[PDB]
Each structure stands twice: as structure tokens, then as C-alpha cells.
Coordinates of C-alpha atoms in Angstrom, one line a residue:
Chain B
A1 CA 0.0 0.2 -0.3
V2 CA 1.2 3.5 -0.4
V3 CA 0.4 7.2 1.2
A4 CA 0.6 9.8 -0.2
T5 CA 2.0 13.4 1.6
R6 CA 2.7 17.0 1.0
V7 CA 5.6 18.9 1.3
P8 CA 5.3 22.9 0.5
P9 CA 8.7 24.6 0.0
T10 CA 7.0 27.3 3.1
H11 CA 10.5 27.4 4.9
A12 CA 12.2 28.4 2.3
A13 CA 9.4 31.3 1.5
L14 CA 10.0 32.4 4.9
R15 CA 13.6 32.3 3.8
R16 CA 12.4 35.1 0.9
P17 CA 10.2 37.4 2.4
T18 CA 8.3 40.4 -0.1
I19 CA 9.5 43.7 1.6
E20 CA 7.5 46.4 1.4
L21 CA 8.2 50.1 2.3
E22 CA 6.0 52.9 3.0
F23 CA 7.0 56.2 2.9
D24 CA 4.9 59.4 3.9
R25 CA 5.6 61.2 1.3
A26 CA 6.0 60.7 -2.6
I27 CA 9.6 59.7 -3.5
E28 CA 11.1 60.5 -7.1
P29 CA 11.8 57.3 -8.2
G30 CA 15.1 57.7 -9.0
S31 CA 16.5 58.9 -5.8
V32 CA 15.9 55.4 -4.0
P33 CA 19.2 54.7 -3.8
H34 CA 20.6 50.8 -3.0
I35 CA 18.8 49.2 -0.4
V36 CA 20.8 46.7 1.4
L37 CA 19.7 44.0 3.8
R38 CA 21.8 43.8 7.1
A39 CA 22.0 41.4 9.7
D40 CA 23.2 40.8 13.5
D41 CA 26.1 39.2 12.2
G42 CA 27.1 41.9 10.3
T43 CA 26.0 39.7 7.0
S44 CA 24.2 42.0 4.1
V45 CA 21.8 40.4 1.7
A46 CA 21.3 42.6 -1.5
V47 CA 17.7 43.4 -2.7
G48 CA 16.4 42.4 -6.1
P49 CA 14.6 44.8 -8.8
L50 CA 12.2 47.5 -7.0
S51 CA 8.6 47.4 -8.1
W52 CA 6.4 49.9 -7.5
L53 CA 2.7 49.7 -6.1
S54 CA 2.3 53.7 -5.9
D55 CA 3.6 56.7 -5.8
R56 CA 4.9 55.9 -2.0
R57 CA 4.8 52.0 -2.0
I58 CA 8.1 50.0 -3.0
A59 CA 8.5 45.9 -3.1
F60 CA 11.3 44.1 -3.4
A61 CA 13.3 40.6 -2.2
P62 CA 16.2 39.4 -1.3
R63 CA 18.5 38.4 -4.0
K64 CA 19.6 34.8 -1.9
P65 CA 17.9 33.2 1.0
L66 CA 17.8 35.2 4.3
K67 CA 18.9 33.2 7.5
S68 CA 15.5 31.8 9.2
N69 CA 14.4 32.9 12.8
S70 CA 17.0 36.1 12.5
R71 CA 16.3 39.8 12.4
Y72 CA 17.1 41.5 9.3
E73 CA 17.2 45.5 9.5
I74 CA 16.4 47.7 6.0
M75 CA 19.0 50.1 4.8
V76 CA 18.0 53.0 2.7
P77 CA 20.9 54.4 2.3
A78 CA 20.8 58.6 2.9
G79 CA 19.4 60.3 -0.7
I80 CA 16.1 59.8 -1.5
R81 CA 14.2 62.7 -2.6
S82 CA 10.5 63.7 -2.1
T83 CA 8.8 64.8 -5.8
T84 CA 9.0 68.6 -3.7
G85 CA 13.0 68.1 -4.3
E86 CA 13.1 67.5 -0.1
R87 CA 16.4 64.9 0.3
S88 CA 17.0 62.5 3.2
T89 CA 20.3 63.7 5.1
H90 CA 19.9 60.2 7.0
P91 CA 20.3 56.5 6.2
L92 CA 16.6 55.5 7.0
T93 CA 15.9 52.5 8.8
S94 CA 13.6 49.7 9.5
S95 CA 13.3 46.0 10.6
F96 CA 11.5 42.7 10.5
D97 CA 11.9 39.3 11.0
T98 CA 12.5 35.9 9.1
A99 CA 10.6 34.4 11.5
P100 CA 6.6 32.4 11.4
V101 CA 3.9 34.3 12.7
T102 CA 1.4 31.0 13.0
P103 CA 1.0 29.7 16.5
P104 CA 3.4 26.9 17.8
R105 CA 3.2 23.2 17.0
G106 CA 2.7 20.1 19.6
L107 CA 4.6 17.4 18.9
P108 CA 3.5 13.9 20.7
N109 CA 5.1 12.0 23.7
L110 CA 4.6 8.4 22.5
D111 CA 7.7 7.1 24.5
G112 CA 6.4 8.6 27.9
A113 CA 9.5 9.8 28.6
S114 CA 10.7 11.9 25.8
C115 CA 9.9 15.1 27.2
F116 CA 13.4 15.9 26.8
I117 CA 13.6 15.6 23.1
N118 CA 10.5 17.4 22.8
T119 CA 11.3 20.5 24.9
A120 CA 15.1 21.1 23.2
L121 CA 13.2 20.9 19.7
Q122 CA 10.9 23.8 20.3
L123 CA 13.8 25.5 21.9
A124 CA 15.7 24.9 18.4
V125 CA 13.2 25.2 15.9
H126 CA 12.4 28.7 17.3
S127 CA 16.2 29.5 17.4
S128 CA 18.2 31.9 15.2
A129 CA 20.6 29.1 14.6
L130 CA 18.1 26.7 13.5
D131 CA 19.5 27.2 9.2
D132 CA 23.0 26.5 11.0
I133 CA 21.7 23.4 12.9
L134 CA 20.3 21.9 9.7
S135 CA 23.1 22.5 7.4
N136 CA 25.8 20.4 10.1
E137 CA 25.7 17.1 8.7
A138 CA 27.3 15.5 11.9
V139 CA 23.2 16.2 13.0
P140 CA 21.3 13.2 12.5
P141 CA 19.8 13.4 9.1
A142 CA 15.8 12.5 10.3
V143 CA 16.3 15.3 12.7
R144 CA 17.1 17.8 10.3
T145 CA 14.2 16.6 8.4
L146 CA 11.4 16.7 11.6
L147 CA 12.8 20.4 11.9
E148 CA 12.1 21.5 8.0
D149 CA 9.2 20.6 7.8
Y150 CA 7.9 21.5 11.3
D151 CA 5.1 24.0 10.5
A152 CA 4.1 22.7 7.4
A153 CA 3.8 19.0 8.0
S154 CA 0.4 17.4 8.3
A155 CA -0.2 15.7 11.8
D156 CA 0.5 12.6 10.2
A157 CA 3.8 13.1 8.6
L158 CA 5.0 15.6 11.5
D159 CA 4.2 12.2 14.1
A160 CA 6.5 9.8 11.5
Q161 CA 9.0 12.3 11.2
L162 CA 8.9 12.7 15.0
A163 CA 9.0 9.1 15.9
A164 CA 12.1 8.4 13.1
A165 CA 13.8 12.0 15.2
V166 CA 13.5 10.3 18.5
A167 CA 15.3 7.0 17.0
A168 CA 18.2 8.6 15.5
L169 CA 18.0 11.2 18.7
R170 CA 18.4 8.2 21.0
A171 CA 20.9 6.5 18.9
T172 CA 23.5 9.5 19.6
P173 CA 26.1 9.0 22.3
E174 CA 24.7 11.9 23.9
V175 CA 21.1 11.2 24.5
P176 CA 19.7 8.4 26.4
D177 CA 19.1 5.1 24.0
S178 CA 16.0 4.9 26.6
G179 CA 14.3 6.7 29.2
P180 CA 14.7 10.2 30.3
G181 CA 17.2 12.9 30.4
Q182 CA 18.5 16.6 30.1
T183 CA 17.0 19.4 27.8
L184 CA 21.2 20.0 27.5
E185 CA 22.1 16.3 25.9
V186 CA 19.1 16.8 22.9
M187 CA 21.3 20.3 22.2
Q188 CA 24.5 18.8 22.6
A189 CA 23.4 16.0 19.8
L190 CA 21.9 18.8 17.9
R191 CA 24.9 20.7 18.2
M192 CA 23.4 24.0 19.3
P193 CA 25.4 26.6 20.0
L194 CA 24.7 27.9 23.7
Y195 CA 27.3 30.0 26.0
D196 CA 27.7 28.6 29.5
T197 CA 27.4 30.9 32.1
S198 CA 30.2 29.7 34.1
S199 CA 32.3 31.2 31.1
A200 CA 33.8 34.6 31.4
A201 CA 31.2 38.2 35.1
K202 CA 30.2 36.4 37.9
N203 CA 26.2 35.8 37.7
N204 CA 24.3 34.0 35.1
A205 CA 22.5 37.8 34.3
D206 CA 25.7 39.8 34.3
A207 CA 27.0 36.9 31.6
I208 CA 24.1 37.5 29.4
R209 CA 24.5 41.1 29.8
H210 CA 28.1 41.2 29.1
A211 CA 28.5 38.6 26.9
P212 CA 30.1 38.7 23.3
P213 CA 28.1 40.5 20.7
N214 CA 25.5 37.9 18.8
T215 CA 25.0 35.5 21.5
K216 CA 21.6 34.7 21.2
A217 CA 21.1 31.3 23.2
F218 CA 22.3 31.2 26.8
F219 CA 23.0 27.8 29.2
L220 CA 22.3 28.7 32.6
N221 CA 24.7 27.1 35.3
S222 CA 25.9 30.0 37.1
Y223 CA 24.6 31.4 40.7
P224 CA 21.6 32.6 41.2
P225 CA 18.8 30.8 39.2
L226 CA 16.7 32.9 37.3
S227 CA 12.9 33.2 37.0
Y228 CA 11.2 34.6 34.0
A229 CA 11.3 38.2 35.6
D230 CA 15.2 38.2 35.8
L231 CA 16.0 36.9 32.7
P232 CA 17.5 40.1 31.1
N233 CA 16.4 42.1 27.9
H234 CA 12.9 40.7 27.8
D235 CA 12.3 42.6 24.1
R236 CA 14.5 40.1 22.3
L237 CA 13.6 36.7 25.0
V238 CA 12.0 34.6 22.3
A239 CA 12.0 31.1 24.1
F240 CA 13.3 29.4 27.1
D241 CA 12.9 25.8 28.6
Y242 CA 10.8 25.3 31.9
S243 CA 11.5 22.4 33.9
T244 CA 8.4 21.1 36.3
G245 CA 9.6 18.3 38.2
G246 CA 10.9 15.3 36.0
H247 CA 9.2 17.2 33.2
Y248 CA 10.2 19.7 30.2
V249 CA 8.1 22.3 28.6
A250 CA 8.8 24.7 26.3
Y251 CA 8.2 28.4 26.2
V252 CA 8.0 29.9 22.8
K253 CA 7.1 33.6 21.3
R254 CA 5.4 33.8 17.9
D255 CA 4.6 37.3 16.7
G256 CA 4.0 39.0 19.9
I257 CA 2.3 36.1 21.5
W258 CA 3.9 33.8 24.4
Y259 CA 3.1 29.9 24.0
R260 CA 3.5 27.4 26.8
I261 CA 4.0 23.7 24.7
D262 CA 3.6 20.4 26.7
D263 CA 4.6 17.9 24.0
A264 CA 1.5 17.9 22.2
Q265 CA -0.5 20.5 23.9
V266 CA 0.1 24.2 22.7
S267 CA -1.5 27.1 25.0
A268 CA -1.3 30.4 24.7
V269 CA -0.2 32.4 27.9
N270 CA 0.2 36.4 28.7
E271 CA 3.2 37.9 30.2
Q272 CA 1.9 37.9 33.5
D273 CA 1.4 34.0 33.8
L274 CA 5.3 33.9 32.8
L275 CA 6.2 36.7 35.6
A276 CA 4.5 33.7 38.2
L277 CA 7.2 31.3 36.7
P278 CA 9.6 30.5 40.0
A279 CA 13.1 30.0 39.3
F280 CA 13.6 26.8 42.3
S281 CA 16.0 22.8 41.1
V282 CA 16.9 24.8 38.0
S283 CA 13.7 26.1 36.6
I284 CA 14.9 28.0 33.3
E285 CA 17.7 26.3 32.1
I286 CA 18.3 27.6 28.3
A287 CA 17.4 31.3 27.1
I288 CA 17.0 31.7 23.8
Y289 CA 16.9 35.7 22.0
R290 CA 16.6 36.6 18.7
Chain L
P1 CA 10.8 61.3 4.9
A2 CA 10.1 58.5 7.4
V3 CA 9.2 54.5 6.2
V4 CA 7.1 51.8 7.4
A5 CA 8.3 48.2 6.8
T6 CA 6.4 44.9 6.1
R7 CA 7.4 41.6 5.3
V8 CA 5.0 38.8 3.3
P9 CA 6.2 35.5 3.1
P10 CA 5.4 34.1 -0.4
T11 CA 3.6 31.2 1.4
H12 CA 0.0 31.2 -0.6
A13 CA 2.5 30.2 -4.1
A14 CA 4.8 27.7 -2.2
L15 CA 1.0 25.7 -1.2
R16 CA 0.9 25.3 -5.4
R17 CA 3.8 24.0 -5.9
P18 CA 4.8 21.0 -3.0
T19 CA 6.9 17.9 -3.1
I20 CA 4.7 14.8 -3.5
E21 CA 5.7 11.8 -1.6
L22 CA 4.6 8.3 -1.5
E23 CA 5.9 5.5 1.6
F24 CA 5.2 1.9 0.4
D25 CA 4.4 -0.8 3.2
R26 CA 7.4 -2.7 1.6
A27 CA 10.6 -2.3 0.1
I28 CA 9.9 -2.1 -3.5
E29 CA 12.0 -2.9 -6.5
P30 CA 13.2 0.3 -7.8
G31 CA 12.3 -0.6 -11.8
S32 CA 8.7 -1.7 -10.8
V33 CA 7.5 2.0 -10.6
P34 CA 9.0 3.4 -13.8
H35 CA 6.1 6.3 -14.2
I36 CA 3.3 7.6 -11.4
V37 CA 0.2 9.7 -12.0
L38 CA -1.0 12.7 -10.7
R39 CA -4.4 13.5 -11.7
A40 CA -7.0 16.8 -10.7
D41 CA -10.1 16.4 -8.9
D42 CA -11.8 17.0 -12.8
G43 CA -9.4 14.4 -13.8
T44 CA -7.1 16.6 -16.0
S45 CA -3.6 14.9 -15.9
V46 CA -0.8 16.6 -14.1
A47 CA 3.0 16.4 -15.4
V48 CA 5.5 15.2 -13.3
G49 CA 9.0 15.7 -13.1
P50 CA 11.6 12.7 -12.7
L51 CA 11.0 10.5 -9.9
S52 CA 13.3 9.8 -6.7
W53 CA 13.5 7.2 -4.4
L54 CA 14.6 8.6 -1.3
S55 CA 14.3 4.6 0.3
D56 CA 13.5 1.5 -0.2
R57 CA 9.6 2.7 0.7
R58 CA 9.3 6.5 -0.2
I59 CA 9.8 8.3 -3.4
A60 CA 9.2 11.9 -3.8
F61 CA 8.2 14.0 -7.2
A62 CA 7.0 17.4 -8.1
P63 CA 4.2 19.0 -10.0
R64 CA 5.9 20.6 -13.3
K65 CA 3.9 23.5 -13.0
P66 CA 2.2 25.4 -10.1
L67 CA -0.9 22.7 -9.0
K68 CA -4.0 24.6 -7.8
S69 CA -4.8 26.1 -4.2
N70 CA -7.6 24.2 -1.8
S71 CA -7.7 21.7 -4.4
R72 CA -7.7 18.0 -4.1
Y73 CA -5.4 15.8 -6.2
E74 CA -5.2 12.0 -6.6
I75 CA -2.1 9.8 -7.1
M76 CA -2.3 7.1 -8.8
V77 CA 0.9 4.7 -8.9
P78 CA 0.0 1.7 -12.1
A79 CA -0.1 -2.3 -11.2
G80 CA 3.1 -3.7 -11.9
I81 CA 4.9 -3.0 -8.8
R82 CA 7.0 -5.5 -7.2
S83 CA 8.8 -6.1 -3.7
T84 CA 11.9 -7.2 -2.7
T85 CA 9.9 -10.5 -1.5
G86 CA 8.8 -11.3 -5.5
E87 CA 4.7 -10.0 -4.6
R88 CA 3.5 -8.0 -7.2
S89 CA 0.1 -5.8 -7.9
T90 CA -2.8 -7.0 -10.2
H91 CA -4.1 -3.6 -9.4
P92 CA -3.6 0.1 -9.5
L93 CA -2.6 2.0 -6.5
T94 CA -4.5 4.9 -5.4
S95 CA -3.5 7.8 -2.7
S96 CA -4.6 11.4 -2.4
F97 CA -4.0 14.8 -0.9
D98 CA -4.7 18.5 -1.1
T99 CA -2.4 21.5 -1.2
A100 CA -4.0 23.3 1.2
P101 CA -2.5 24.6 4.3
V102 CA -1.9 22.7 7.7
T103 CA -1.4 25.7 10.0
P104 CA -4.0 26.7 12.0
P105 CA -6.4 29.2 10.8
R106 CA -6.1 33.0 11.9
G107 CA -8.7 35.5 13.6
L108 CA -10.1 38.6 11.7
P109 CA -11.7 41.7 14.3
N110 CA -14.2 43.3 14.1
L111 CA -14.3 47.0 14.9
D112 CA -17.5 47.5 13.2
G113 CA -20.0 46.1 15.4
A114 CA -21.7 44.7 12.2
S115 CA -19.1 43.2 9.8
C116 CA -19.5 39.7 10.8
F117 CA -20.6 38.8 7.5
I118 CA -17.6 40.0 5.7
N119 CA -15.2 38.6 7.9
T120 CA -17.4 34.8 8.0
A121 CA -17.4 35.4 4.0
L122 CA -13.5 36.1 3.9
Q123 CA -12.6 32.7 6.0
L124 CA -14.9 30.9 3.9
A125 CA -13.3 32.1 0.8
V126 CA -9.5 31.4 2.0
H127 CA -10.5 27.9 2.4
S128 CA -12.1 27.8 -1.0
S129 CA -11.0 25.6 -4.1
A130 CA -12.0 28.6 -6.2
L131 CA -9.6 30.8 -4.0
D132 CA -6.9 31.2 -7.4
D133 CA -10.5 32.2 -9.2
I134 CA -11.5 34.8 -6.8
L135 CA -7.3 36.1 -6.4
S136 CA -7.3 36.3 -10.2
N137 CA -10.2 38.2 -11.2
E138 CA -9.8 41.8 -11.7
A139 CA -13.5 42.6 -10.8
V140 CA -12.9 42.1 -7.2
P141 CA -11.2 45.1 -5.5
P142 CA -7.2 44.6 -5.2
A143 CA -7.4 45.1 -1.6
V144 CA -9.5 42.1 -0.9
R145 CA -7.1 39.8 -3.1
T146 CA -4.3 41.0 -1.5
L147 CA -5.5 40.5 2.0
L148 CA -6.9 36.8 0.5
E149 CA -3.0 35.9 -0.7
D150 CA -1.9 37.2 2.5
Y151 CA -4.2 35.4 5.0
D152 CA -1.6 33.0 6.3
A153 CA 1.7 34.9 6.2
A154 CA 1.0 38.1 7.6
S155 CA 2.1 39.7 10.8
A156 CA -1.4 40.1 12.8
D157 CA -1.2 44.1 12.9
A158 CA -0.3 43.9 8.6
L159 CA -3.1 41.7 8.3
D160 CA -5.4 44.1 10.3
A161 CA -4.6 46.6 8.4
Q162 CA -5.6 44.8 4.9
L163 CA -8.8 44.3 7.0
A164 CA -9.5 47.3 7.0
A165 CA -9.1 48.4 3.9
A166 CA -10.7 45.1 2.5
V167 CA -13.8 45.9 4.5
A168 CA -13.5 49.5 3.2
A169 CA -12.9 48.5 -0.5
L170 CA -16.2 45.8 0.1
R171 CA -18.5 48.0 1.7
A172 CA -18.1 50.5 -1.2
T173 CA -19.1 47.5 -3.7
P174 CA -22.5 47.3 -5.4
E175 CA -23.3 44.1 -3.6
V176 CA -22.1 44.8 -0.1
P177 CA -24.1 47.4 2.3
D178 CA -22.6 50.7 2.7
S179 CA -22.6 50.8 6.1
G180 CA -24.5 48.3 8.7
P181 CA -24.9 44.9 9.2
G182 CA -25.3 42.4 6.2
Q183 CA -25.3 38.7 4.5
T184 CA -22.7 36.1 4.0
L185 CA -24.1 36.2 0.2
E186 CA -23.3 39.6 -0.7
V187 CA -19.7 39.1 0.4
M188 CA -19.6 36.4 -1.8
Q189 CA -21.3 38.0 -4.9
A190 CA -18.7 40.3 -4.2
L191 CA -15.9 38.3 -4.6
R192 CA -17.7 37.0 -7.4
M193 CA -17.4 33.4 -5.7
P194 CA -19.2 30.3 -7.8
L195 CA -22.3 29.1 -5.9
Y196 CA -25.1 27.1 -6.6
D197 CA -28.4 27.5 -5.8
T198 CA -29.9 24.7 -4.6
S199 CA -33.7 26.5 -5.3
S200 CA -33.0 25.7 -8.7
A201 CA -33.4 22.4 -10.0
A202 CA -34.2 18.2 -7.4
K203 CA -36.4 18.4 -4.4
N204 CA -34.1 18.9 -1.3
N205 CA -31.3 21.3 -0.5
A206 CA -29.1 17.6 0.1
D207 CA -30.4 16.2 -2.6
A208 CA -29.7 18.9 -4.8
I209 CA -26.3 18.9 -3.3
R210 CA -25.9 15.3 -4.1
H211 CA -26.7 15.3 -7.6
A212 CA -25.1 18.4 -8.7
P213 CA -23.2 19.2 -11.9
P214 CA -19.6 17.7 -11.5
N215 CA -17.0 19.9 -9.5
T216 CA -19.4 21.8 -7.9
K217 CA -17.4 23.3 -4.4
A218 CA -19.3 25.9 -3.2
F219 CA -23.5 25.3 -2.6
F220 CA -25.9 28.0 -1.1
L221 CA -28.5 26.7 0.5
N222 CA -32.3 27.7 -0.3
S223 CA -34.5 25.2 -0.7
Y224 CA -36.4 23.1 2.4
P225 CA -35.8 22.2 4.7
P226 CA -32.6 23.8 6.3
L227 CA -29.8 21.5 7.2
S228 CA -28.0 20.9 10.3
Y229 CA -24.1 20.2 10.4
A230 CA -25.3 16.2 10.2
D231 CA -28.4 16.9 7.7
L232 CA -25.3 18.1 5.3
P233 CA -24.3 15.0 2.4
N234 CA -20.3 13.8 2.0
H235 CA -18.8 15.4 4.9
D236 CA -15.7 13.9 4.0
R237 CA -14.7 16.7 1.6
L238 CA -17.1 19.4 3.7
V239 CA -14.3 21.6 4.5
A240 CA -16.4 24.8 5.0
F241 CA -19.8 26.7 6.2
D242 CA -21.3 29.1 8.3
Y243 CA -22.9 29.7 11.1
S244 CA -25.5 32.5 12.3
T245 CA -26.9 32.7 15.7
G246 CA -29.2 35.4 15.5
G247 CA -27.3 38.5 14.1
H248 CA -24.1 37.4 14.8
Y249 CA -22.0 35.2 12.1
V250 CA -19.6 32.3 12.7
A251 CA -17.6 30.4 10.7
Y252 CA -16.9 26.8 10.7
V253 CA -13.5 25.7 8.7
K254 CA -11.6 22.3 8.3
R255 CA -7.1 22.3 8.4
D256 CA -5.9 19.0 8.6
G257 CA -8.6 17.3 9.3
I258 CA -9.9 19.6 12.8
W259 CA -12.7 21.8 12.6
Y260 CA -12.1 25.0 13.6
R261 CA -15.0 28.1 14.7
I262 CA -13.9 31.6 14.4
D263 CA -16.0 33.9 15.8
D264 CA -14.6 37.5 14.4
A265 CA -10.9 37.0 16.6
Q266 CA -11.4 33.4 18.7
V267 CA -10.4 30.7 16.9
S268 CA -11.4 27.7 18.8
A269 CA -11.0 24.0 18.2
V270 CA -14.2 21.8 17.8
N271 CA -15.0 18.1 17.8
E272 CA -17.5 16.3 15.8
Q273 CA -19.8 16.6 18.9
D274 CA -19.9 20.7 19.4
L275 CA -20.8 20.4 15.5
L276 CA -23.8 17.7 15.1
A277 CA -25.1 19.8 18.2
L278 CA -25.3 22.8 16.2
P279 CA -29.3 23.7 14.9
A280 CA -30.5 23.9 11.5
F281 CA -32.6 26.9 12.5
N282 CA -34.3 29.6 15.3
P283 CA -37.0 28.3 16.9
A284 CA -38.4 31.6 17.0
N285 CA -37.7 33.2 13.9
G286 CA -37.5 30.4 11.5
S287 CA -34.3 31.3 10.2
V288 CA -31.9 29.3 8.5
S289 CA -28.4 28.7 10.4
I290 CA -26.5 27.2 7.5
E291 CA -26.2 28.8 4.5
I292 CA -22.8 28.2 2.5
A293 CA -21.3 25.3 2.6
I294 CA -17.9 24.9 0.9
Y295 CA -16.5 21.5 -0.4
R296 CA -13.3 20.6 -1.7

């Protein structure tokens, strides 16, 4: 017998959005300089031919795939001119994000003790390193497959891919071949870039604040333990694990909405709910920023 | 000169060019499956690119040209397949899939207070197999087409702006009330969505649905008696329908086999019991509850 599945290339779509810039005044088409998209790591993506939707609105697309779950700054050099001859003496700047706006998904736990694999995968998929995880061949292939088809897979196909991925993760050295484990083991199998706060600073918060540039994910192994409110730079906090005692859940933020994902249960949460999350066993162990 | 930036990921076209996969129950001999056939819900054959074997059990191919959106497609593996155990297939094998989203639906705010009908109709139209024909029709206001294309991939703020523009352009149309509450059918008339009046020839709504022309997907239920969820025929292909609670419209839409109730901006997942409990008409008024039903 045969089973048919459809895998739409929507992730790659998220990597080549169609950006649109609307201006306060009518702009002269030939004043528009070359627009550059720039990332938090310094890399610049070029912008394709400009299409004018109105005397004020222009539309373009990155020349090359942008990174996933990454923030990008649109830089319009100085020199644009209005239809009245005015000029912009300053580079104009805006921003956007290559992340999904739809709500997170739930990953089943058919093992009974696969909480930690699911939580770690939830934190990784919402991670700025998802593209970097997906390119490392040393990573089990099935995990990469689950992480690329995450948002766009039938639940049935997501469930089969998850079974195969859990199988391949337990097959690794770092991860238990059976039974429960730790989020850190799965992240190490994923080759996720983390910043141990023991390296460096004296506490977790100071290492997060006084960390090298472009450090997004932190592993909190210093003292004191932190709660949600203690996490620095809340404006960029996008994911973090929470440990309820032999059970891991994920807290992941999408399009300004926080969600709590316990295996296959996605439930939306507000900031006040999060602020009640205590720190005591470490509660928050991995904190992922954008 | 200041700027406002928006990001619209090309998710709609992505759904129209999927990569299809067939997994088999047993290891298959690579040379036993030489040609697979893709066919559309109208029977037309769609051309397919090279066949790729990802494993002894899994094959992967891709449409040559964009498929239609929110549309069903049937895959046939011809007879002659052979397993590694010598077995053979005396009959052509068949499966199916649809180019529709698996993501959960979105919510549309109602700042008007009486724009329930616009939101409900747009929700039904976006889950329609005729979405491509609506988006290509120049007679439909351009803001509405933009909203219907950016439905799944737009920021909540950007979707809200698009919705304001779409409601504005809709109320301006002849079909739709310039102000105040209204009816789903007026929005469908503006969108020019193909509808099949069951009052037209048939004796019941359901019998008109069953004995309808081929490839009739959207129905306007204007015969007697009114139908409940259970009375609607062919539940297996039902993907959307409206529900009217008395001057207030909600939508019921199915995605990846899961039904959702969208009351303006409130998306809530529902089970079969909730639907089977939905009444067919109000006792005092006598008003039809479900009037538009959309199939795949």
C-alpha cells in the first residue's frame, strides 16, 4: 500500500519574504538608492529589482535566501528625494523578522519519557541557529527533516518524522538510548551553539548582558537561578525551557504571543502568567534570544 | 521622509508547488515503479518531473507546473509494482492529498460591530478551492485579493490593516451594504465566488447537493428544509460552512482534518459533537442557520 504526503516549500518562502516599504511622502523613483538588508552578524543580503505599488510604496525581495528566525534591518542609504525636491540627509532604517507568525505546534510524546527531546526541539526550531543546525551534516538527518517540515507538515507526517527523529537522537552517544534525560543532552546532539554562563562576569544575568556580540542562546549554570522576570532583555527573549520536575515544557514566542508547549499541548500565555514562573532544581536552563 | 516596513512570505505560491511523496508498506524494486500519474479533481492529468527514490519504501516527485490551491489531487501508482519478496500488484494503487494549509486558521477582528458577515465570508473564501480564481479576478477589489493572498503569512498588525482596507473596499461595492450589518451572500457576490443555488433544479437542499453538476464545490442552501451539520451530505469533503447565531456570524472551517470555529477574532478548535449539536434553524424566527457550505 501507499501513503501520499505533501511537503510545501514554505520555510524557504520564509527565507525570501517580499518586503514592502511605504513612505510618508511621494518619492522620486530615481532617488531610491540601493537598499541593503543587514543582519546581527554583519552579513548583508542584496535586494532585487524594485517594483512600485504606488507613488509611496515600493516592493522588493532579497537576492538570496535570508537566515531563518533571524532579525534583519532594512537600510535605505541617505539620498532619497521627495517629489518636491526634499532630501533625506540621514540613512533611513526599518526592521523585520524571518520567523513564522502562525502559532507553534505540539509534538507528541509516544515514549512516555520523551519530554526533553520535544522541549529541546521546540527551543531549537524557534532559534536563530535553526539554519545553522539544519546545515550541519554531523546532525542526524531525520532531526533536520523534522525541523525543516515543522510548521508545514501534516500532523501525521510530523508524527512519523518525530518518531524517526527521536529514534536517531537516542542513537547518539550524548542522549539516553532509552528513558528520560536532560535538555542539554539533546542540544549537544543538535550541535546547538550555547553560551555557558560559567565561562566569562559572575552571575547568569551579567554574563547574558556582558556576553560577546551576537550571543543568542545561553545555558544558565551559574548562581543565582533566574525566573522569567529576572531574564534580561525581555524585548528579545523568544524562547526558554521550563522544568516542572521530571518534565520539560517549552515557552516560545511568536508574533508577539507567548505559548506554552507541553508535548502536544500548545496553550497561549500572557506575560503575567510568565512572571509567576519561579526559579526553584533550576527552572529555566536555556534562554534563547533573537 | 519616514518609512513603514512589511514582510509577506510567499507562502501561498509555496502551497501551489509542493513536493509530493509516496511511502510504501514494503521495500519496492526500483524498476517496478517507472511512471506515476497525477490527476486533478476534474480528471485532467498533471505532468510530473523525474521520480526520486528516497528509500526502498519512499518515492518523491514534484509537479511540473503550479497546482491549484485549496484543491484535491489524486495519485495513481500503476499496476506492476514488485516487492523485494517477489510479490506483484495486479491492480493500480491510489492515494490522495490536497494543496491546502495545515497551519491553524487566523482571526479577523470586527471593529465595525456589524462586519461579522464580511469576516465570515472571507474566511469561507480563503478555504475555497476557488481561491485562485477569486485572486485572479480583476473585478474583485484589489485590497480584498491582497488580504486573501497574505492570509497565512502576514503579521497580525499587517493583516489588520489589510482587513480594514478590504472591508472598506467591500462596503463600497454594489453588492455589499455601504454601512450596517449584512449577509454572507452579498460578500460572496462581491468576491464573485461560484455558488450553486439549491432552490434551482431536485427537491431538497441535500438532494440538490448530491445530484449536482460535476466539480460543484460551493453551495448556497436556499431550499427546504434547512440542514444541520449532520444533514449536510458527504461530510468527508466538507471543508467550510457558515453559522448564524442571530445577527452574528461565525465560520466553521476544516484544516488538516481539524474543525475550527472562528467568531470574528476567536479561533477555537471544535469536535464532532459540537458540530452535531449545532441547530439547523432558530425556533422563534424560523431562520436558516447554515446557508453556505464549501467542499473540496
